[PDB]
Write a protein that binds this ligand. Structure first.
Ligand SMILES: OC[C@H]1O[C@@H](O[C@H]2[C@H](O)[C@@H](O)[C@H](O)O[C@@H]2CO)[C@H](O)[C@@H](O)[C@@H]1O
Ligand SMILES: [Ca+2]
Length: 769
């Protein structure tokens, strides 16, 4: 490996060998169908709300999130980079697709597949990833840096459906070598959203933009139809000319054929025919190819940028609504703008790289933090782009000031902005894209007094319940299979209108979003104030025994939605205490004296009774009425965790909080698989895991990262990082279970998982407050 010296990969990048087999991989631990796309994954390309494309560590474009809210894992084999090399003096050169695999059928059989093992590495530090190619049959060593412009406090480039592939080629040998790099792409119009005639009318055109010192050659892969539909739009690939490279292209090759129409050209001398051809296809799949060819002398390095864009302006949800995607604000809505997007990227990628470096640098340069923590902190952010992210710029047929946003809880449980989860998972948005965060919270504010009296069948018990109760915060803002932002509470496993955590979490999120954006946004507090008061007042009505605290009802009426709580729970009780303290402070800020007084009175009564009911001398009991009421819950003091972040002080005595955190580390962490797998949710006082429900026997990745941040704020530095380390290890390490770029909700002691690609572990960013 002589190429690594010519590029700048951070030491904290996650790494794996190209073509590496992973032996230890986990699988779903439930009986019902659950997504398991394998460990062959990578950092995604594409902006927020753009639709994303997962290019894996083996080189294939395989995890397709272009249909917003859906996950489709299938390798489109025509989509590749390939290399040609010929040493001066040799008769023939060699050509190789840079993909560690081959197609399942006979299509593209002429191409040289099966990039060999031990010949290159993949590296990821989101939003950047890299591949190096160090192959004994390729005298010129190559590397590529690929990324999308995901930039905190930037709501423009961050939305773009674009990726840059910045290639570096170096000749360490003592002979001249001719080199070509070729990007191939299938015209994917009709890949989704088209019920019939899936390739018909697809056609490819070549664009040559020859303006002084900025020559670009691109293929635009579209359809002859000007229809404005979810399926229609354009893909573009292309390259910018640099000194010492020549560009060649082929507008049209057949992807549903043996591929030799293209490969016979590339394999001969690395130069394509430059044949334009706009003839539309009928049944056959087609694709385009863009290549560069150059001669490298001994010791010479060259850099050349390629790009990919996709202009698919309309997203459709299963309930029938069609929306424009956010990036259409910047490029237009007609779906004929892929070249414009590509051109912006090719002309500005160096600036974008620097903007990314500028945001990563403060963390990466901090030599007090271990590399592994940096690996997890950046790579967990993959989910902000890969979580079915929807970001609208108008309904089709519709202008509003704001652009609604939604991130999925996960794909298996396909609900937008699951609030009991976003309490943990929204830290990166408040910290890095706060205008999105505040918009999402205003979305929730607007739903508080919505009433929907139609009934749904509750999954857990078969009972009928009202869809949405006035004054109760919704569980979620709908499903991609139905109507995001329009039909809320798509979740039906439990009835969220009787949940004891949602209303308190809502208030805590509101106050968090004020505190972590500088305590300046009075107007955000003004917008949300009525909903905050309503939420707490409604939750107070669920106090059955007048101890000042809502009563859990002996069912799973909160985020642990198979783990029943009864009476006063540590979890919902502490959240309630903190929400009351937050509402007191908002009342002071807004000069609402009567609110301050009321919530202060409620807080003092509840705080006294919480302490008396639950403090056992060593920790806070799980609850007051369950069979295993004395279980040690990892999340028992979630309200105090948020109170630290919100700077609300002690809601419980410092001494008792410290004892409880030490107990949790001693038991839930250290007595669960030697503390190498995170914090198990429930442990019995005898040091055996609580078996009352499956969720007690799970480590929740987002709960564990949040607990680590809590420990860190409380000065338990070693404990904090050791607790988080188990989550990192399981996700990323060779000794783990292969969950990189699909961090799950949970795993059990065997390492097998529930719900890959999950929002909650974004809570790692709470460690940076
Ligand atoms: O619906 C989301 C919800 O699913 C829960 O799993 C259920 C599943 O939905 C149901 O179809 C199956 O028959 O039973 C399981 C329970 O064992 C899951 O446990 C929840 O955490 C999740 O929110
Ligand atoms: Ca009560």
């Amino acid at each position: 490996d002589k190429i690594s010296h010519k590029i700048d990969i951070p030491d904290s990048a996650w790494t794996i060998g190209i073509g590496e087999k992973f032996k230890n991989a986990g699988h779903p631990n439930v009986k019902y169908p659950m997504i398991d796309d394998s460990y062959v994954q990578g950092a995604p390309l594409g902006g927020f709300g753009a639709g994303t494309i997962g290019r894996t560590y083996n080189g294939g474009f395989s995890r397709w999130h272009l249909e917003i809210g859906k996950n489709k894992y299938t390798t489109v084999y025509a989509n590749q980079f390939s290399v040609f090399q010929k040493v001066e003096g040799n008769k023939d050169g060699v050509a190789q697709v840079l993909y560690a695999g081959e197609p399942e059928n006979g299509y593209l059989s002429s191409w040289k597949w099966d990039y060999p093992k031990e010949s290159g590495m993949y590296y990821a530090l989101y939003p950047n990833s890299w591949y190096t190619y160090t192959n004994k049959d390729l005298p010129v060593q190559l590397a590529v840096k690929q990324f999308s412009p995901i930039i905190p406090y930037n709501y423009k480039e961050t939305s773009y459906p674009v990726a840059v592939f910045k290639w570096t080629a170096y000749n360490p040998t003592n002979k001249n070598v001719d080199v070509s790099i070729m990007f191939t792409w299938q015209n994917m119009i009709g890949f989704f959203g088209k019920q019939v005639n899936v390739n018909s009318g697809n056609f490819n055109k070549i664009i040559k933009d020859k303006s002084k010192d900025s020559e670009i050659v691109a293929a635009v892969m579209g359809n002859i139809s000007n229809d404005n539909e979810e399926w229609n739009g354009e893909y573009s690939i292309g390259v910018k000319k640099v000194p010492g490279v020549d560009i060649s292209y082929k507008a049209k090759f057949v992807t549903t054929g043996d591929g030799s129409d293209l490969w016979h050209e590339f394999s001969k001398n690395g130069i394509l025919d430059n044949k334009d051809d706009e003839t539309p296809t009928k049944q056959d799949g087609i694709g385009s190819a863009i290549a560069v060819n150059f001669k490298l002398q001994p010791g010479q390095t060259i850099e050349v940028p390629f790009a990919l864009s996709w202009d698919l302006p309309i997203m459709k949800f299963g309930g029938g609504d069609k929306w424009y995607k956010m990036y259409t604000k910047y490029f237009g809505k007609n779906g004929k703008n892929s070249f414009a997007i590509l051109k912006e990227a090719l002309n500005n990628y160096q600036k974008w790289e620097k903007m990314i470096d500028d945001w990563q640098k403060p963390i990466l340069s901090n030599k007090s933090k271990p590399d592994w923590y940096k690996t997890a902190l950046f790579n967990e952010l993959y989910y902000l782009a890969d979580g079915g992210t929807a970001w609208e710029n108008g309904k089709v047929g519709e202008k509003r000031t704001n652009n609604m946003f939604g991130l999925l809880g996960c794909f298996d449980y396909n609900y937008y902005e699951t609030l009991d989860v976003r309490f943990y998972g929204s830290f990166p948005l408040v910290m890095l894209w706060p205008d999105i965060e505040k918009q999402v919270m205003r979305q929730f504010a607007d739903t508080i007094n919505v009433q929907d009296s139609s009934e749904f069948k509750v999954g857990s018990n078969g009972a009928m319940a009202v869809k949405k109760v006035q004054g109760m915060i919704p569980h979620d803002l709908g499903s991609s299979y139905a109507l995001p932002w329009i039909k809320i509470n798509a979740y039906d496993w439990q009835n969220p209108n009787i949940w004891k955590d949602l209303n308190s979490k809502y208030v805590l999120l509101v106050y968090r979003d004020y505190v972590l954006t500088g305590k300046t946004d009075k107007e955000f507090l003004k917008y949300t104030w009525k909903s905050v008061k309503t939420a707490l007042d409604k939750l107070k009505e669920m106090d059955k025994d007048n101890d000042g605290i809502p009563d859990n009802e002996g069912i799973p009426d909160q985020t642990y939605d198979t783990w029943s709580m009864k009476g006063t729970s540590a979890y919902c009780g502490s959240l309630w205490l903190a929400a009351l303290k937050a509402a007191q402070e908002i009342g002071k800020v807004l000069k609402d004296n009567e609110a301050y007084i009321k919530y202060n009175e409620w807080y003092k009564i509840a705080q006294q009774n919480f302490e008396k009911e639950l403090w056992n001398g060593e920790y806070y009991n799980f609850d007051t009425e369950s069979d295993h009421k004395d279980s040690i819950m990892a999340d028992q003091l979630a309200g105090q965790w948020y109170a630290d972040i919100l700077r609300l002080g002690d809601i419980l005595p410092k001494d008792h909080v410290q004892k409880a955190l030490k107990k949790i580390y001693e038991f839930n962490v250290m007595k669960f698989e030697n503390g190498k797998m995170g914090a198990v949710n429930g442990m019995r006082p005898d040091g055996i895991v609580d078996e009352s429900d499956i969720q007690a026997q799970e480590v929740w990745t987002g709960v564990t990262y949040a607990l680590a941040s809590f420990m860190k704020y409380r000065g338990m530095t070693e404990e904090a990082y050791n607790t988080a380390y188990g989550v990192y290890k399981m996700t990323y390490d060779k000794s783990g279970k292969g969950y990189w770029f699909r961090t799950p909700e949970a795993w059990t002691k065997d390492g097998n998982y529930r719900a890959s690609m999950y929002m909650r572990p974004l809570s790692i960013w709470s460690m940076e407050v």
